[PDB]
Design a protein around this ligand. Structure first.
Ligand SMILES: CC(C)CN(C[C@@H](O)[C@H](Cc1ccccc1)NC(=O)O[C@H]1CO[C@H]2OCC[C@H]21)S(=O)(=O)c1ccc2ncsc2c1
Lengths: 99, 99
């Protein structure tokens, strides 16, 4: 689809078999989701945003469907203010900016 | 133009007589620019993201040219690590997400 930006670009995602809402975020290198339970192993990591750094659990090679498009990649889980879909998965679903 | 997301979507902007690099950021409600000494009145604001909040100065009706496309709107100035072009201006240059 073509998504205009007068509203937040929020979409439904499926991860771990659960549905969630997430923000298509071209300013995010990585995908960061709010606290949740995810199966499989993970490694602790740090990520920095506009306000500083937070601790996150890094899950590798996670299946995640974004607005009907499938991706498999790294997902960070931690105290983010909003579920954000970052460029590591936006590229997988073929997302571009156009003007 | 069409901008793929393999790398950060950095573009050249012109604001306050200065050229700068900034992110086309669909995850940003507002536009947030690195510290710069703009003239005119402003009002304080707090914006939150990953890591917490930062204090910024809100300037209204600021002229900003984004990759050759003129716009005018609210610009927030503060200790952000990156120049961020938010949705308030992306809509003005006709920017969409497409996949
Ligand atoms: C978190 C989202 C919802 C909101 N942000 C926008 C998002 O694109 C930020 C932009 C950014 C900030 C600092 C350095 C690089 C890029 N990216 C981000 O945090 O990415 C994380 C995850 O991947 C990593 O790569 C990049 C950094 C890591 S924001 O900056 O906090 C914001 C902007 C306007 C605004 N107006 C009212 S609130 C408000 C809040």
């Amino acid at each position: 689809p073509q998504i205009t930006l007068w509203k937040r670009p929020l979409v439904t995602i499926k991860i771990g078999g659960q549905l969630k809402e997430a923000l298509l975020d071209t300013g995010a290198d990585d995908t960061v989701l709010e606290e949740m339970n995810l199966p499989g192993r993970w490694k602790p990591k740090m990520i920095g945003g506009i306000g500083g750094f937070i601790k996150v659990r890094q899950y590798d090679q996670i299946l995640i469907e974004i607005c009907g498009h499938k991706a498999i990649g790294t997902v960070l889980v931690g105290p983010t203010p909003v579920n954000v879909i970052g460029r590591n998965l936006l590229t997988q679903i073929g997302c571009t900016l156009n003007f």
